[PDB]
Amino acid sequence: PPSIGIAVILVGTSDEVAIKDAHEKDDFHHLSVVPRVELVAMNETDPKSIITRICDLMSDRKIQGVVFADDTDQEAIAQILDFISAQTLTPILGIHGGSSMIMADKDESSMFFQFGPSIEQQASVMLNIMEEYDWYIFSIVTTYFPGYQDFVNKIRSTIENSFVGWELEEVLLLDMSSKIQNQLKKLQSPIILLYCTKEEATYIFEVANSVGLTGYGYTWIVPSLVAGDTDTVPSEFPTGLISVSYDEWDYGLPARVRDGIAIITTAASDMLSEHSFIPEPKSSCYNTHEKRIYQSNMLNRYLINVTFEGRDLSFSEDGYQMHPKLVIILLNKERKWERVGKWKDKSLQMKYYVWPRM
Ligand SMILES: *[C@H]1O[C@H](CO)[C@@H](O)[C@H](O)[C@H]1NC(C)=O
Ligand SMILES: *[C@H]1O[C@H](CO)[C@@H](O)[C@H](O)[C@H]1NC(C)=O
Ligand SMILES: [Cl-]
Ligand SMILES: [Cl-]
Ligand SMILES: [Cl-]
Ligand SMILES: [Cl-]
Ligand SMILES: [Cl-]
Ligand code: NA
Ligand SMILES: [Zn+2]
Ligand SMILES: [Zn+2]
Ligand SMILES: [Zn+2]
Ligand SMILES: [Zn+2]
Ligand SMILES: [Zn+2]
Numbered sequence: 001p002p003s004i005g006i007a008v009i010l011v012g013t014s015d016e017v018a019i020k021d022a023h024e025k026d027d028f029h030h031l032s033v034v035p036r037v038e039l040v041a042m043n044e045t046d047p048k049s050i051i052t053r054i055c056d057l058m059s060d061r062k063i064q065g066v067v068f069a070d071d072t073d074q075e076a077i078a079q080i081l082d083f084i085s086a087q088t089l090t091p092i093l094g095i096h097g098g099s100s101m102i103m104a105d106k107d108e109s110s111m112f113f114q115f116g117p118s119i120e121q122q123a124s125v126m127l128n129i130m131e132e133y134d135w136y137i138f139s140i141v142t143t144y145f146p147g148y149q150d151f152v153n154k155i156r157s158t159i160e161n162s163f164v165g166w167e168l169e170e171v172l173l174l175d176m177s178s179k180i181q182n183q184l185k186k187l188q189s190p191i192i193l194l195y196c197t198k199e200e201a202t203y204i205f206e207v208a209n210s211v212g213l214t215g216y217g218y219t220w221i222v223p224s225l226v227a228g229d230t231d232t233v234p235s236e237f238p239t240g241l242i243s244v245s246y247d248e249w250d251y252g253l254p255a256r257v258r259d260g261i262a263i264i265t266t267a268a269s270d271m272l273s274e275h276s277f278i279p280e281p282k283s284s285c286y287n288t289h290e291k292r293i294y295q296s297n298m299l300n301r302y303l304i305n306v307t308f309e310g311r312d313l314s315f316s317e318d319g320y321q322m323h324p325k326l327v328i329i330l331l332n333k334e335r336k337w338e339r340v341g342k343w344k345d346k347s348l349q350m351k352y353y354v355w356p357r358m
Contacts, residue, residue: 001025002033004268004278005063006261009054011070011077012045012097017254028261029309032269033278035261038063045072051080055285058088062281064268065090067260069253070097073198073228078103078114086110088282089296091264091303095256100246101225104147106319109293111300113263115256116246118320119147122223123154125244126193128348129221129328129341131164133355138191139170141184143200148173151195151223176200180207187213192220198228205236214238216357227329230337239358241331246324249339263313267302333358 008019019039020026028035038061042053057063066085070077077098085092086107094100094114102119106112117125130138140155142148152171159166169189174180174196184207192213196204201222208214220241227243272278279295306313314322328341328350341350 002269002272002278003036004033004065004265005036005038005061005281006264007038007040007054007057007061007063007066007068008257008260009040009042009050009066009068011042011050011068011072013041013069013071013253015041016252017257019257028265031262031265033265033272035265036062037261045070045074047074047076047080050077051084051285054080054084058090058281058285059283062283063090064279064281065264066092067095067257067264068092068099069095069256070099071229072098073232074098075101075103075197075225078112082106082110082112084285085112087285087288089279089290089292090282091267091299093260093263095260096246096248096253097229101228102147102223102320104145104150109296110319111296111303113303113315113319113321115321115324116224117244117324117326118316118318119151119223120154121320121324122244123151124158125326125328125343125348126221126223127155127158128343129242129350130191132348132350135191135219136165137167137169137189138193139172139187139189140168140193140195141170141172141174141187141204142195143174143176143197143204145196145200148195155193174200174204176203178207180204181211184208184213185211190218192218194220194222194226196226198226198234201226202234202236205234205238209236209238216240227337230329233331233335233337237331237335239331239333239335243329243331243337244343245327245329245337247327249327251325259308259311259313262308263303263306266306266308267299270302271299330356331358 091111100114326343
């Protein structure tokens with residue numbers, strides 16, 4: 001009877017997820033370790049309540065992994081999660097929501113992994129797109145949000161060694177606090193890559209709009225986290241906003257949760273398989289006598305590499321999904337987001353030959 005407690009935390013999600021009450025210890029998809037899954041649906045959605053709720057839970061019950069989803073647009077959630085994964089040397093998966101928005105810096109000791117694309121993959125795709133439509137002259141505009149440095153580099157890198165005639169005209173760096181205007185006015189290019197948070201973005205646009213740089217002639221392309229919840233669209237978001245997004249259509253929540261439990265339950269089974277051990281439950285986020293810093297690294301070798309049934313879920317070093325299915329989307333005229341492209345693996349399939357006008 002090899003068990004492993006898993007917490008499924010669902011902050012703000014509509015309760016459409018139903019987990020087997022674990023009476024009959026029937027095994028999960030024929031894996032050696034039975035996951036004892038504890039469901040939890042927090043109502044309050046502020047980070048404070050989450051840190052409290054997750055932590056309390058970890059001392060009360062015997063948890064050796066956390067699958068965590070939220071329907072909020074708070075990248076904040078990611079900090080609290082990386083922190084906990086670190087303090088407790090426990091794997092925590094950022095399955096969806098703010099909890100999975102690119103966290104650039106990340107405690108290299110933590111086991112916080114996020115679903116969806118890395119800052120790099122996303123950059124590599126935004127260029128992948130600009131080619132399909134021979135959009136070669138462009139400016140970058142980032143804020144100070146962690147990642148900006150890593151993002152700009154990925155662009156500059158792929159540019160340098162490319163036969164294609166890329167012209168990176170400007171790169172801005174916005175000290176938010178409206179001195180932005182004097183900066184954003186200096187923009188010439190037609191294509192603009194804007195790297196920042198959703199909330200930062202809405203200010204940045206409100207400004208550009210009353211400077212014209214947002215309209216016809218200018219198309220803005222933007223990372224997955226600025227789209228955020230596609231159901232919430234700022235007034236200031238320009239129609240004709242291109243964005244990369246994780247795929248919330250063919251990939252429902254319950255499928256991720258399944259995948260979450262799978263990732264962990266596999267790693268655990270493959271460790272019990274190679275060493276008669278599964279790391280005891282750590283029971284404090286704070287009071288840390290759990291200097292068990294070694295059995296961690298071992299687990300971490302198995303989590304990082306799961307492939308389950310059809311899907312491949314192996315993770316990158318910086319804790320992003322290595323092979324995510326992406327969707328390019330477009331802020332239309334009626335102000336919804338349309339699907340207008342897919343990305344499989346280095347394979348960018350678009351829907352239109354003539355790029356639409358909104
Ligand atoms: C959630 O439900 C409880 C139960 O009565 C309520 O008192 C609380 O304020 C609610 N919070 C939100 C954001 O709806
Ligand atoms: C993950 O990496 C290891 C290390 O050699 C490899 O042997 C393993 O089979 C990989 N995952 C899969 C599904 O092959
Ligand atoms: Cl929110
Ligand atoms: Cl993201
Ligand atoms: Cl950075
Ligand atoms: Cl299942
Ligand atoms: Cl499509
Ligand atoms: Na993500
Ligand atoms: Zn199955
Ligand atoms: Zn092409
Ligand atoms: Zn979703
Ligand atoms: Zn051993
Ligand atoms: Zn791939």
